[PDB]
Amino acid sequence: SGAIYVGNYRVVNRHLATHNDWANLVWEDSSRDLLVSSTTAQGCDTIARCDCQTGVYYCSSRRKHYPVSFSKPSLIFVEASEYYPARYQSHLMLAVGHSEPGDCGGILRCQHGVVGIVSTGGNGLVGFADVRDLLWLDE
Ligand SMILES: Cc1ccccc1CNC(=O)N1CCC[C@H](C(N)=O)C1
Ligand SMILES: [Zn+2]
């Protein structure tokens, strides 16, 4: 679990969105596993606007932060799950690092701010949904 709170927006994994997220829907994209809802309170987070390929992520299944080198956002095949059929997930970045399904929502950050959130993984890999291209989150 986990979310990004920037301005009057809450960014969550689309597969973990609540009934309240859907009732306050701003934008969603199944191919990216992202959903953004509106908030009444002002958020605590800053979004990175950069091309960093290193950063640090929070891993809830270890209660620890880990440094990672990750690939640029790209189109990657993801096997069928209970949430989605087998498909290509877009804007996904992979890195070597521990992850389990409940780690989805953990933030990846570089020195410029929030880069993305955990969305997939397994076998010593962790995959992050990028948010750096969503320039509208800042206004
Ligand atoms: C092993 C692991 C580690 C971290 C996260 C997930 C997993 C394994 N489940 C998994 O990949 N999916 C279920 C949740 C939604 C995911 C998606 N983006 O399509 C697909
Ligand atoms: Zn950066």
Coordinates of N, CA and C in Angstrom, one line a residue, residues 10 16-25 35 37:
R10 N -4.2 12.8 -5.2 CA -3.7 11.6 -4.5 C -3.4 10.6 -5.7
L16 N -5.4 -0.8 -6.5 CA -5.6 -0.6 -5.1 C -6.5 0.6 -4.8
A17 N -7.1 1.2 -5.9 CA -8.0 2.4 -5.7 C -9.2 2.0 -4.9
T18 N -9.6 2.9 -4.0 CA -10.8 2.7 -3.2 C -12.1 3.2 -3.8
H19 N -13.2 2.9 -3.2 CA -14.5 3.5 -3.7 C -14.4 5.0 -3.7
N20 N -13.8 5.6 -2.6 CA -13.7 7.1 -2.5 C -12.8 7.6 -3.7
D21 N -11.7 6.9 -4.0 CA -10.8 7.3 -5.1 C -11.7 7.4 -6.4
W22 N -12.4 6.3 -6.7 CA -13.3 6.3 -7.9 C -14.4 7.4 -7.9
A23 N -14.9 7.7 -6.7 CA -15.9 8.8 -6.6 C -15.3 10.2 -6.8
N24 N -14.0 10.3 -6.6 CA -13.3 11.6 -6.8 C -12.3 11.5 -7.9
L25 N -12.6 10.7 -9.0 CA -11.7 10.4 -10.1 C -11.3 11.6 -10.9
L35 N -4.0 5.6 -10.9 CA -5.2 6.3 -10.8 C -4.9 7.5 -9.9
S37 N -6.9 10.7 -7.9 CA -8.2 11.2 -7.3 C -7.9 12.6 -6.7

